[PDB]
Amino acid sequence: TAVVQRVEIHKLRQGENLILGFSIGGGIDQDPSQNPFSEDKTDKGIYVTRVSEGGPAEIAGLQIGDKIMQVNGWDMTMVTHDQARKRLTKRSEEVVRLLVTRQSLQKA
């Protein structure tokens, strides 16, 4: 089935911006049916839709299709898009410790 893993990403300080190098989709305030990475099309959780090449997230292990369970202690399963966006962009945290799950593959 699906395996659970944790990814720790050190943000990239570009001038005055902090970059993680990935994109998200999902959230309770969004239509879960438009999600190709979730087995259950009702799942409105947060998912990684993009991972920039040579970015912090890619180097850290983040993979497209990964579902973000929690970020630095905060839960990410029952939040809105903006909420997840804010919890990943808190300027006071140079690092984000992600708890994610991904189709384990290796499941022939």
Binding site: I24, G27, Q30, T49, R50, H81, A84, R85
Partner: peptide
Amino acid sequence: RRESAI
């Protein structure tokens, strides 16, 4: 579907 680049 909305999408945020971070």
